[PDB]
Design a protein around this ligand. Structure first.
Ligand code: A1A1I
Ligand code: ZN
Lengths: 276, 322, 298
């Protein structure tokens, strides 16, 4: 079982924090088959949208947490609907990203900026309507534990020196961005929703680490993440063959935060090789 | 400095509520006729044409008058009461209700209205209605059109306060521009009646461009010693200009001049954002350091990415230009 | 929203307007926060979304409940639970004799519990001021106005700089610290604690530097032996005057020798060493705590 990766926390009690995190993992449901409700869409249409949302996040230097909040909002809202046509996908995705940016970032882009990137297919008033529609269909449960929020915890636990010190970032910027790159190509596959977000992060970490470090930093047993690792195999092989990118720099973003900014490079080319 | 405040907000009077009706009519009683005009019992403001005058009426007779005066025309005669405040009003302006709303919610009448001054009149007489309401018999004053250089020279200083986008404001017509400028000078009332009883726009601009470089400091009135502010610190947070008219929750009307820096003022209480005339800012009561005369408020930012992190609104009723 | 009947205006918080309204079905008084969506250029304000999301995951006896959320065209209503006052008005109404010590202890041993609950959920209130702590006639104190709250991740990152009202701002926030965490809230509580015992604000500064200098005067000027890293902090200037740690027997005269220790730990300069919410609930000061009922004036 997931015993206790967290160290002794001073600001709170480790048991309560871990229990709350695990209960969050169980209260926000995800369905990999949320596309069978919409007979017109296909899995490739989801990736194309999510890929696009990465690109926008790169243009405005939006954090990875914002993109994964948008992805969660999309895959939860779309599971509560029926017969959605591909024309509305872009509006739903842009509204989800707008909500995530408002939720997470200090200075989110203004609404007109979000409308502009849509190239006129969506307007400010459409986005305002769809954002309320999403926040209502989700029952205002807009605080999940995303796939990258778990990787942050795993990397913090993996690199600890003076006990505690779990809230101040301490870990390499080059290993975090390699795994986050394998987690953006895996997120474009709808089957990724079959496994819990924590297990996805642990599987990526293992794929770029040892089977002992993952269990030390996450508390999962081999039998828990075995299926996820098996499924991630062909998504890790492609990334390894291509070669991991480097920690790019951004204007106006401190050199100690460049690993928390989404980086769209190319995912629809590696995804079709992985799915092959 | 830079102001990403959307200065259109102050003129909208958002603090007055949400559901407001927006009458889009007009009326201009003859350019020389004896008229009977209903008066507001308590408004002591000296209204200049073109000004927005918010009002929050609670008195039953005031509410009745506004409700019955809403249909048949919308003009009420706001007198410019002389230094002898009680009655003794010889001139005045007419206001026209352009934003009306009732609120019986909470079990109280409370009528919120917004009117803009239209004409100027000499009060030939003052009769009393059967319910504490003044019907003023008033002869409309003529506008004596008889100039460009004066307007441009005034703009030369109107740009230093709130660097202007373009000539969109300050209408070209001499009368409109003169009245709009007169509405902004922090001068006191005695000079305000003279500026209102001018007449042709030329002498008005020559009295405005006159008192624009002569006055040196705005100082405490009730003691006369403290030096509160100077024009170098003045600036306008609203399209209307440095000064404007607002209403506090109790109906009182305040002419608050916006400045960047004031001195000799001490703050009372803690910042609050209730009924704030400038959305996104908090107000703290300000009193002078020598006689504790409520002089104005110190507004401070409360949201993210606000350009002016702090300014002052000084009520003109407690300032004596010098 | 045709079911609710307004009764009176309560006031305005971080956003929206709060009204007292009685539910015509069950006849139970409730607070109603109204947000005019039409005036809002960027749809629902970020503060509203953050609150509604956070308040639907926090269910504690010491945090005001979010009973419902309603949307009627161009208007968003949040239906909270009704409380009879705010600590500020209570303190002013009891500014002659003062709040009895057992009531102060109970009120401090009811904000620490809610704060610990929030922190275990990884939520930063960041707006702990007397106007946001609501008290009812049964003797319970509850946190409110989570509009400025934020859910901090593990690990934390750089969040909104200038936060919290000036009177209740921690020195690390004042000095432009890069990372801040739960500790800030604790500072606020300390500032509130000393306010209840003394009945007046502990650090009443009108500007950032003035507040910093009042803090230094009361607690001394921090060096690298008490706060390692100050002398490198972004907003630290070596020209700061040297003051020396006014004794706590003169800062809060009425407090005992355990209340003094708890306040000192709550007001520690170093955020790492500053006492945590759960580490304060085990303090001896909260050994004979009770739940006295205040006698509110309305
Ligand atoms: C039941 C309960 C009671 C109290 S209470 O009684 O403590 C409180 C009522 C109070 C609020 C403040 N006014 C005091 C008045 C002072 C005068 N005024 C004012 C304003 C502007 C003025 C002005 C004025 F005079 N003048 C002379 C001016 O000229 N201007 C201008 C204006 C423009 C400008 O720019 N500049 C100026 O100067 C404002 C009102 C009432 C007294 C204190 C607290 C809480 C509750 N219950 C409760 N339950 C449940 C919830 C749930 C959620 C929640 O959030 N809340 C609360 C909402 C807010 C906080 C939390 C809840 N609350
Ligand atoms: Zn004075």
């Amino acid at each position: 079982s997931r015993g206790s990766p967290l160290p002794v926390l001073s600001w709170a009690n480790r048991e309560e924090v871990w229990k709350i995190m695990l209960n969050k993992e169980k209260t926000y449901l995800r369905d990999q088959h949320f596309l069978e409700q919409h007979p017109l869409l296909q899995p490739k249409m989801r990736a194309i949208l999510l890929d696009w949302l990465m690109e926008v996040c790169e243009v405005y230097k939006l954090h990875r947490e914002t993109f994964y909040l948008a992805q969660d909002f999309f895959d939860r809202y779309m599971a509560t609907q029926e017969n959605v046509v591909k024309t509305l996908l872009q509006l739903i995705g842009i509204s989800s990203l707008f909500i995530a940016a408002k939720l997470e970032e200090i200075y989110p882009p203004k609404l007109h900026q979000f409308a502009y990137v849509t190239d006129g297919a969506c307007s400010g008033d459409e986005i305002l309507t769809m954002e309320l529609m999403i926040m209502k269909a989700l029952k205002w449960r807009l605080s999940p534990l995303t796939i990258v929020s778990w990787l942050n915890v795993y990397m913090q636990v993996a690199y600890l020196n003076d006990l505690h010190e779990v809230l101040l970032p301490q870990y390499p910027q080059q290993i975090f961005i390699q795994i986050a790159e394998l987690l953006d190509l895996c997120v474009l596959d709808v089957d990724c929703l079959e496994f819990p977000y924590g297990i996805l992060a642990a599987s990526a970490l293992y794929h770029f680490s040892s089977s002992e470090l993952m269990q030390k930093v996450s508390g999962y047993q081999w039998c828990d993440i075995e299926n996820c690792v098996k499924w991630m195999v062909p998504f890790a092989m492609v990334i390894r063959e291509t070669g991991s990118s480097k920690l790019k720099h951004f204007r106006g973003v401190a050199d100690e935060d460049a690993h928390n900014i989404q980086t769209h490079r190319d995912s629809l080319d590696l995804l079709d090789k992985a799915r092959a | 400095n830079i102001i990403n405040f959307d200065t259109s907000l102050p003129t909208s009077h958002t603090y007055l509520g949400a559901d407001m009706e927006e009458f889009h009519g007009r009326t201009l009683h003859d350019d020389d006729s004896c008229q009977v005009i209903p008066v507001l019992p308590q408004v002591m403001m000296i209204l200049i044409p073109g000004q927005t005058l918010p009002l929050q009426l609670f008195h039953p007779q005031e509410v009745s008058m506004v409700r019955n005066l809403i249909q048949k025309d919308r003009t009420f005669a706001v007198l410019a009461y002389s230094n002898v405040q009680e009655r003794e009003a010889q001139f005045g302006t007419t206001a026209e209700i352009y934003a009306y709303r009732e609120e019986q919610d909470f079990g109280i009448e409370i009528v919120k209205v917004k009117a803009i001054g239209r004409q100027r009149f000499k009060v030939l007489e003052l009769r009393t209605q059967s319910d504490g309401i003044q019907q003023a018999k008033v002869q409309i004053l003529p506008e004596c059109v008889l100039a460009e250089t004066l307007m441009d020279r005034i703009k030369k200083q109107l740009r230093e306060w709130d660097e202007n986008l373009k000539d969109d404001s300050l209408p070209s017509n001499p009368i409109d521009f003169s009245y709009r400028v007169a509405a902004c000078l922090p001068i006191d009332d005695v000079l305000r009646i003279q500026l209102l009883k001018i007449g042709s726009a030329i002498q008005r601009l020559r009295c405005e461009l006159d008192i624009m470089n002569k006055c040196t400091s705005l100082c405490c009135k009730q003691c006369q010693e403290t030096e509160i502010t100077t024009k170098n610190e003045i600036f306008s947070l609203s399209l209307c200009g440095p000064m404007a008219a607002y209403v506090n929750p109790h109906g009182y009307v305040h002419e608050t001049l916006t400045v960047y820096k004031a001195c000799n003022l001490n703050l009372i209480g803690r910042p609050s954002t209730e009924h704030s005339w400038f959305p996104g800012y908090a107000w703290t009561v300000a009193q002078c350091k020598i006689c504790a005369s409520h002089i104005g408020w110190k507004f401070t930012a409360t949201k993210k990415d606000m350009s002016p992190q702090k300014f002052w609104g000084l009520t003109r009723s407690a300032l004596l230009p010098t | 929203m045709e079911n609710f009947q307004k009764v009176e205006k309560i006031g305005e918080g971080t956003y929206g307007v709060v009204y007292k309204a009685r539910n015509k079905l069950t006849g139970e008084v409730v607070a109603l926060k109204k947000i005019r969506l039409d005036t809002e250029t960027e749809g629902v304000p970020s503060t509203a979304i953050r609150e509604i999301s956070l308040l639907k995951e926090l269910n504690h006896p010491n945090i005001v409940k979010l009973l419902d959320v309603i949307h009627t065209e161009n208007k968003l209503y949040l239906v909270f639970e009704f409380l009879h006052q705010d600590l500020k008005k209570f303190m002013d109404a009891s500014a002659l004799t003062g709040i009895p010590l057992p009531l102060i202890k109970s009120y401090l041993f009811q904000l620490l519990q809610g704060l610990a609950f929030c922190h275990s959920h990884r939520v930063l209130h960041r707006d702990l001021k007397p106007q946001n702590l609501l008290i009812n006639t049964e003797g319970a104190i509850k946190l409110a106005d989570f509009g400025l709250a934020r859910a901090f991740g593990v690990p934390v990152r750089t969040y909104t700089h200038e936060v919290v009202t000036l009177w209740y701002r921690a020195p690390e926030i004042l000095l432009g610290c890069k990372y801040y965490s739960t500790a800030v809230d604790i500072w606020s509580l300390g500032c509130i604690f000393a306010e209840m015992v003394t009945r007046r604000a502990l650090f009443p500064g009108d500007s950032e530097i003035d507040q910093l200098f009042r803090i230094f005067r009361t607690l001394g000027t921090p060096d690298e032996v008490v706060w390692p890293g100050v002398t490198s902090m972004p907003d630290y200037k070596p020209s700061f005057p040297k003051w020396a740690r006014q004794d706590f027997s003169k800062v809060v005269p009425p407090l005992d020798e355990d209340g003094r220790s708890l306040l000192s730990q709550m007001l520690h300069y170093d955020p790492n060493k500053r006492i945590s919410a759960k580490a304060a609930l085990a303090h001896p000061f909260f050994q004979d705590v009770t739940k006295p009922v205040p006698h509110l004036r309305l």
